């Protein structure tokens, strides 16, 4: 019930929300069917339109007008945005030359430059170039301010997940808005686009920017706009709020546009119908900037022009139907479209089996346009699993396609030409970022970055301490002229042991053998030097990784590689080695094929054993530093130490062996040498965070050797590839991956072919940021470089995407 008989008289677009049954006058009351009876008349005036014309100049104020051209309008804060232009000989903001904003130029009583977030739904990154002719205001913001070529959205590349990631700095699995549609089994409640459930606060986790601001004494405009409020009214409402007295005036505001997403769905991303929507957004930007100029705020306000996701060409004829795959189609519920999520239709049906559903969906047709995954097998860069609202079974849908349950769903639910939702690495889903204002840099282009980073910067722009989130605070310092956040490196928690030779060979009873007895002060001085770290500078280029949790581990030096060996997990946490452009690949000699060697620096009790691998019929083993890359026959023996060995399913060894034998050398060739850090990851509860030992669900049979869920590598070289990786004077270049450690290659439909046809494609799909590896390992990389710490944070958030330009 709402007592709609109250009135909006002097309450139009009020900032405090009133609770039922009192009637509302705020910018969301329409959406709730709760506005006062006189809201339209009072608050949504339209008379005479939105622009001053010469004849209205100095009019007598008529309060019926949508906006005003009378002399008192600047004091009242409610002129038409073109008032000064038409009536006072002023120029439109877009016509003025740009001039650097070195310091905020604000009216008296402004405590800080306000922040205005101008968000545009469906605004694809390439519209900045392709549409540039018809967007002069947006083009001026972009060229005069700070801009990225694109900004990466979160997965799924849907509206609400992305807008709420913008507002919180959190992945969707952590903020809880994991799609535009959801079922929460604990609430037994469903969230949808249409309806009222979605307004219930229990869906919405984390702490969005408006709440962060309010808790710390910074007032916020209400960010959400009901759809029938016209854009011109939204802009005039923001500008009016900006004329409130100091004590009442918000410092942060948002505007939202349903365009260009609305028309992109109907016409496709580049339909000729798309020009008009882009012109219209531009005109809205021009209204805002003109309105700020009138208020003397155009060199005071920081403006962020930001999109949520792009738009791809997708048509009804490109739908895959689960009825072409599953016999039991009526026993499942599908969340359909540009992603798939599958769960059981009834929890009372115990003949529902996810394994047989996955199998029926796996590489069943030559051209199949979606790939099924248990959510924990999805690429870790998507961070899309650790939420009860995310169904165990997921379908990653190819760009340009939909998945649906049955054909009748597509014509009794073509009607559309664009859609979005796909993998957040897809070019068509990339969106835009421009920052313009005193706090942003002048005419500066910055590299693409991820939208989870923006919340931190929005907090910096408003002098707020960000709530805990998934941005890496400091990684976007290079966007800002001032207000940078000067992070310190985390403190190492565990210091390493440096074991010398402490064990005789016969103390080990590991069931390992090696043909290594084939056997000098010239050479013997040298090997001692190597075991004490004499080549450490060559193989450990950026310092040892810091261990940021409590653990027991040893640093182990060798000719060709250095490792941080965990006595708790019985394997290295990290292995570090450098491969020059000139390095040679060799084979594993015939006599050494099954060689494993006890490491006399590490107790038997803290070593793996070969008997466990013999007894475990499913599990084999691999090496972190690859024997193929040994610098010499004698050095090669180091690669077979039991302390360089890790458990690997045979299927995964096909992947690993190809990476180590072929690809590392290819990279050293292309990049002028590479430094590699490889190691295991254990994320059995799929939370993106390192597992403690009591979370491990699987061990090599009969032993305490834990089995990794994933293997990572960080591959660093010099950004200026004219310098070799080990003598780089400036910025670095990095690519990384987190490969899932699986007992089959069912993910790779071409896996029966030679590794050269499928392995690198797998690795590309599992590309990662150094930062993703840091969360999964509790390690901190790049601690000793000649680079600024902020620049290193940016490197650590880098994702190498493999998309074309
Ligand atoms: C991205 O950034 C985010 C934010 O920094 C990172 O997420 C954080 O990770 C922390 C570590 O996992 C986690 O800390 C836990 O918090 C528990 C208290 O949680 C409540 O309070 C906070 C603070 O306001 C609030 O934010 C939480 O909100 C969550 O929950 C509701 C849903 O219930 C949602 O509205 C919201 O969306 C959010 O959900 C997300 O997180 C939860 C987990 O909290 C997931 O279940 C969801 O899927 C969703 O992703 C909460 O309202 C606290 O109680 C925990 O402490 C337990 O564990 C420690 C171990 O050290 C132990 O000391 C304690 O005793 C306790 O154990 C007890 O519970 C156990 C499990 O139930 C049980 O086994 C034991 O026997 C004990 O009884 C813990 O400290 C923090 O909450 C989240 N924060 C957020 C916002 O998500 C995220 O990790 C980053 N991602 C990456 C990859 O880096
Ligand atoms: C009410 C409603 O349902 N919508 C969404 C329609 C989805 C349509 N759609 C479906 C498929 N494709 C497109 C409208 C909406 C959205 C955001 C918003 N304000 C806002 C501004 C800034 C921010 C961040 C940037 C801080 C967050 C929120 N006001 C209104
Ligand atoms: Ca974990
Ligand atoms: Cl969805
Ligand atoms: K075995
Ligand atoms: Zn859309």
Curated annotation (Swiss-Prot):
Disulfides per UniProt: 8-25, 12-43, 23-36, 29-35, 52-69, 57-87, 67-80, 73-79, 98-144, 106-300, 316-414, 363-749, 512-610, 514-595, 718-728
Effect on the protein upon substituting residue 159 to S: 15% of wild-type lysophospholipase D activity
Region Nuclease-like domain, annotated ranges: 541-805
Cofactor(s), by name: Zn(2+); Ca(2+)
Cofactor note: Binds 2 Zn(2+) ions per subunit.
Hydrolase recorded as keyword: yes
Catalysed reactions listed for this entry: a 1-O-alkyl-sn-glycero-3-phosphoethanolamine + H2O = a 1-O-alkyl-sn-glycero-3-phosphate + ethanolamine + H(+); a 1-acyl-sn-glycero-3-phosphoethanolamine + H2O = a 1-acyl-sn-glycero-3-phosphate + ethanolamine + H(+); 1-(9Z-octadecenoyl)-sn-glycero-3-phosphoethanolamine + H2O = 1-(9Z-octadecenoyl)-sn-glycero-3-phosphate + ethanolamine + H(+); a 1-O-alkyl-sn-glycero-3-phosphocholine + H2O = a 1-O-alkyl-sn-glycero-3-phosphate + choline + H(+)
GO molecular function, one term: nucleic acid binding
Effect of residue 261 to N: Abolishes lysophospholipase D activity
Residues at the catalytic site: 159
Regulation: Inhibited by vanadate. Inhibited by micromolar levels of bile salts, such as tauroursodeoxycholate. Not inhibited by taurodeoxycholate. Not inhibited by hydroxysterols, such as 7-hydroxycholesterol, testosterone, dexamethasone and prednisolone. Inhibited by EDTA and EGTA.
Gene Ontology BP terms: cell chemotaxis; cellular response to cadmium ion; cellular response to estradiol stimulus; estrous cycle; immune response; negative regulation of cell-matrix adhesion; phosphatidylcholine catabolic process; phospholipid catabolic process
Protein name (Swiss-Prot/TrEMBL): Autotaxin
